[PDB]
Amino acid sequence: TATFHRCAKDPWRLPGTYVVVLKEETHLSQSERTARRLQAQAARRGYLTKILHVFHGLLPGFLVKMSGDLLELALKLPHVDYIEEDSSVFAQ
């Protein structure tokens, strides 16, 4: 069952954008259909979404701009391992 994570440093959180990470085996084709399925399910519920990027190479999944309202729904999508809210990094 998939879990949700966001930065423990509150000022460093960037809500409204989420990294959806799929299970290791997940193939690029499946990643893309999962993202399309989210947009569609999101649309039926009145929510605009934007798929900003689909990951292939290290980590299967995608980057989606959406309301956090949609996280329960997104966590029930097929192949989902976990979802992480984007956050800031800084030059050291």
Binding site: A8, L63, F90, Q92
Partner: protein, 489 residues
């Protein structure tokens, strides 16, 4: 005229990394600066959040100079490629960094080259996805070097610093002490692998094509190790991550940092190592691996694992309170690990692994249960040709030559290896009234494989190897026992 930091990483005996490429994920850079012109390629990958060329280019230009700069670089004339994931105020996102790492991996697949070092001079809070991405990219055979972070805090709370399969670098100054930065300073803790020069580091300034500026930070420090690693990989292209990390540790200057600067609990967890180039036969490399603290749960166990190509040669445990049930060596996936048990009413324990590169090695564990109503629990490597490299012990209660001895109520575990090329000896030092700790050290040219306290009724907090010294911590007498081995050719 030689900058202090370039002299500092020069070994006691000394005479670029051209078949290695270094990737830099930072701000944009002034690529035509004379320190780096012609040797750094801008990929023009950009992914940065919304917010002067010189100001924007400042951080990345300096770092490119530190790694490979013509006059002030570590690996002068090594090749670099730069990606932009930080904006003009030096800020980026995890997703942006994720996409950049993905970009590096795709490029490698499309056009394979040699060893790749990835420098990540950036930090955010602990991130599961960023750590997984670094782990993945490392398991694909890339070397990642990252900044410990500048928050004067435990680096395990930040990423990518806390990612176990990356090399995380803290910053020290010309006095070999941890760098202060305003009210903060270098991070520390068991997620930091070593330190390197990170104060008053001169390098390319994006103010003008020939200008130079001095900067401070764990980014600068990480840049030194990235360049050192480039040199190590150029000389020994076949090194695995574990072999490279053991060399970085081995060729580092030891115990020059004054640990008092760190908060109390973090002093044992923090490697006292300042990086250095190798001076340039087979010998025995070991390193000490601390687990995450187990936690207070009743059946809590902390686990310390070696890399796949290392052997676990011994296993100890430590608790600040001293409420502990010891440690055992056990197999998982067919690899032995070090597993420590918390006392039911305790706050938690650390497991502490001693992990070594021993290829011609067939090792195993021998265990005896409590003897009870005997002198003590004993076990030993019975066959000829096998050497004992470590003793461990764990018990179930709350109250209480080639051979290990334990308390009569405890189980006893010996690590035994068949390794003919290897010679080992045991050195002991006992202190009647332990002031706070008793230590004993292997002779120069020998490697500590095992560290433990001689059994009794001492209220010992635990034991651990610090480089080649065995440290036993106490709250009759207390005796430290070190097992030391060296190659013979």
């Amino acid at each position: 005229s030689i900058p202090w930091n370039l002299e500092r990483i020069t070994p006691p005996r000394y005479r670029g990394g051209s078949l290695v490429e270094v990737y830099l994920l930072d701000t944009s850079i002034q690529s035509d600066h004379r320190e780096i012109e012609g040797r750094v390629m801008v990929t023009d990958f950009e992914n940065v959040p919304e917010e002067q060329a010189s100001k924007c280019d400042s951080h990345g230009t300096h770092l490119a100079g530190v790694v490979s700069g013509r006059d002030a670089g570590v690996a002068k004339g090594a090749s670099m490629r730069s990606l932009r994931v930080l904006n003009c105020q030096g800020k980026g996102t995890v997703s942006g960094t994720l996409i950049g790492l993905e970009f590096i991996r795709k490029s490698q697949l499309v056009q394979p080259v040699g060893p790749l070092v990835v420098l990540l001079p950036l930090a955010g809070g602990y991130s599961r996805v960023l750590n997984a991405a670094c782990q993945r990219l490392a398991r694909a055979g890339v070397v990642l070097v990252t900044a410990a972070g500048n928050f004067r805090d435990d680096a395990c709370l930040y990423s990518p610093a806390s990612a176990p399969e990356v090399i995380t670098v803290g910053a020290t100054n010309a006095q070999d002490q941890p760098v202060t930065l305003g009210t903060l300073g270098t991070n520390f803790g068991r997620c930091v692998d070593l330190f390197a020069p990170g104060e008053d580091i001169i390098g390319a300034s994006s103010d003008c094509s020939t200008c130079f500026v001095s900067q401070s930070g764990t980014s600068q420090a990480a840049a030194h190790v990235a360049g050192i690693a480039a040199m190590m990989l150029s000389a020994e292209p076949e090194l695995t991550l574990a072999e490279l990390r053991q060399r970085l540790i081995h060729f580092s200057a030891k115990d020059v940092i004054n640990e008092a600067w760190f908060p109390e609990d973090q002093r044992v967890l923090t490697p006292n190592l300042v990086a250095a180039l190798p001076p340039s036969g087979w010998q025995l490399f070991c390193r000490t691996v601390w687990s995450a603290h187990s936690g207070p749960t009743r059946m809590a166990t902390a686990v310390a694992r070696c890399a796949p190509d290392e052997e676990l040669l011994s296993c100890s445990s430590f608790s600040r309170s001293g409420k502990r049930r010891g440690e055992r060596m056990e197999a998982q996936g067919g690899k032995l690990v070090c597993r420590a048990h918390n006392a039911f009413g305790g706050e938690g324990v650390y497991a502490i692994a001693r992990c070594c590169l021993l290829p011609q090695a067939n090792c195993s564990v021998h265990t005896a249960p409590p003897a009870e109503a005997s002198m003590g629990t004993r076990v030993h490597c019975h066959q000829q040709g096998h050497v004992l490299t470590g003793c461990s012990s764990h018990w179930e209660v709350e109250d209480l030559p080639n051979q290990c001895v334990g308390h009569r109520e405890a189980s006893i575990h010996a690590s035994c290896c068949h390794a003919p090329g290897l010679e080992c000896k045991v050195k002991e030092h006992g202190i009647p009234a332990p002031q706070e700790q008793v230590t004993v050290a292997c002779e120069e040219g020998w490697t500590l494989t095992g560290c433990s306290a001689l059994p009794g009724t001492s209220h010992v907090l635990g034991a651990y190897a610090v480089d080649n010294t065995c440290v036993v911590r106490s709250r009759g007498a207390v005796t430290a026992v070190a097992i030391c081995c060296r190659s013979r050719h």
